[PDB]
Design a protein around this ligand. Structure first.
Ligand SMILES: Nc1ncnc2c1ncn2[C@@H]1O[C@H](CSCc2cc(C(=O)O)cc(-n3ccnc3)c2)[C@@H](O)[C@H]1O
Ligand SMILES: [Zn+2]
Ligand SMILES: [Zn+2]
Lengths: 116, 296
């Protein structure tokens, strides 16, 4: 039995249909002079980013469903996630749809310069 | 003007009065502060609380232990915990709890009434936002409340390390005489009103550097009457100014010493080090917590 609820895909399709994104993500006060990296131990937003509490931007945390990997582990909870200011109306959507460059720590396509 | 502070602490002369309890009637009752774009009241509020705590002699040991009661919101997240985790040194053990379910950035979360929470270890800092809205009944006498306050007084006495500190939310009607009396068991205490919520009778009762014994005798009925009198005669201008300068926000890593000492072995020299925010007295074992579960 290969049945596995696919919440990531259900949320993306909910957004595409024109559904209002998950709200009440926890936005932090910070200097906005930070390194700009994607997921950090304290708020780290730069001039064009907002910083949020990790758990509140995790689809799995927010929906009370399991995390998709063998260990139950969440890489957002207990950290802070930097969201481009133009995408901060949907931090959950953003963290789902994007990937963190494993060498510079930035969002691929939103600060990562390693492929120039 | 205090509009550039994070908030206003109760002046010492108001603590020394013997007022009788009146109804709280705030001048700025109707007003609201304009928060920075997209910032929640609970984030602004805890930020200002932490900015004020930055001015006290908090003990900040390595492997600091912080527990936060009343941390859930009606929207299922923990904004106050997120600020505490931002404020506390990286690696600080932060435990979370609330009656209702929520997701949290804390190292561990316990769901249920706080009276079901037990911990083996002692703590360096206790934060409480617990509040029952059913206490704002304007039509009966405002007496000392128990509920969760009874747990909190016991928890401080049994599980707060000497030298540790406390910040417990109160309001006009949500308060407790023994908790005020316990403030006299610290080297110093105040009632702190955040500038962003200064239109509310809420305050945080802050005990700074626990001493385990009475330093002052405090009548908690008189002291809450004094607190209301201060609030009634001292309109506080709503302000979010301090929210815009976060450059010095993180709690200063003081490396405060931790010792395991026994009740007959606490000098006036020790008491004095406790009073200065230079000593934490507790065991340094592993942190173990549990929630009691009633089965049918
Ligand atoms: N004994 C206890 N044990 C463990 N947790 C406890 C205990 N008592 C309270 N809490 C927790 O404290 C948190 C903050 S108070 C939330 C609140 C504020 C206001 C306000 O501000 O007016 C109003 C309401 N309201 C309720 C219904 N219509 C409005 C609720 C909260 O998540 C609650 O579950
Ligand atoms: Zn998660
Ligand atoms: Zn890169």
């Amino acid at each position: 039995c290969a049945f596995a609820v696919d919440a990531a895909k259900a949320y993306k399709d909910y957004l595409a249909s024109g559904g209002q994104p998950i709200t009440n993500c926890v936005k932090m006060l910070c200097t906005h002079t930070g390194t700009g990296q994607a997921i950090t131990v304290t708020p780290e937003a730069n001039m064009d980013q907002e910083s949020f509490g990790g758990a509140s931007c995790c689809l799995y945390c927010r929906c009370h469903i399991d995390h998709p990997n063998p260990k139950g582990f969440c890489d957002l909870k207990g950290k802070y996630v930097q969201i481009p200011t133009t995408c901060a109306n949907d931090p959950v959507g953003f963290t789902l749809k994007n990937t963190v460059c494993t060498v510079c720590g930035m969002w691929k396509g939103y600060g990562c310069s390693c492929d120039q | 003007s205090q509009a550039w502070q994070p908030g206003v602490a109760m002046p010492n002369l108001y603590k020394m009065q013997r007022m009788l309890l009146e109804k709280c009637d705030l001048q700025n009752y109707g007003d609201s502060a304009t928060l920075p774009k997209g910032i929640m009241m609970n984030v602004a509020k805890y930020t200002q609380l932490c900015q004020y705590l930055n001015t006290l002699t908090l003990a900040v040991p390595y492997n600091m232990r912080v527990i936060h009661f009343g941390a859930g919101s009606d929207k299922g997240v923990a904004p106050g915990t997120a600020v505490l985790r931002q404020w506390l040194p990286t690696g600080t053990l932060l435990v979370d709890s609330d009656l209702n379910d929520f997701v949290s950035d804390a190292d561990s979360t316990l769901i249920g009434d706080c009276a079901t929470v037990h911990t083996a270890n002692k703590w360096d800092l206790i934060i409480s936002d617990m509040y029952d809205p059913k206490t704002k009944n304007v039509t009966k006498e405002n007496d000392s409340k128990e509920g969760f306050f009874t747990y909190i007084c016991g928890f401080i006495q049994q599980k707060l390390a000497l030298g540790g500190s406390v910040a417990i939310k109160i309001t006009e009607h949500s308060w407790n005489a023994d908790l005020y009396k316990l403030m006299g068991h610290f080297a110093w205490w105040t009632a702190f009103v955040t500038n962003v919520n200064a239109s509310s009778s809420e305050a945080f009762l802050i005990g700074c550097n626990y001493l385990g014994k009475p330093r002052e005798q405090i009548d908690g009925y008189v002291m809450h009457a004094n607190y209301i009198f201060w609030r009634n005669t001292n309109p506080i201008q709503l302000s979010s100014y301090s929210l815009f300068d976060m450059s010095k926000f993180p709690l200063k890593l003081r490396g405060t010493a931790v010792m395991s000492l026994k009740e007959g072995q606490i000098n006036d020299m020790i008491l004095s080090l406790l009073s200065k925010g230079r000593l934490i007295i507790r065991e340094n074992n592993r942190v173990v917590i549990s929630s009691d579960v009633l089965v049918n």
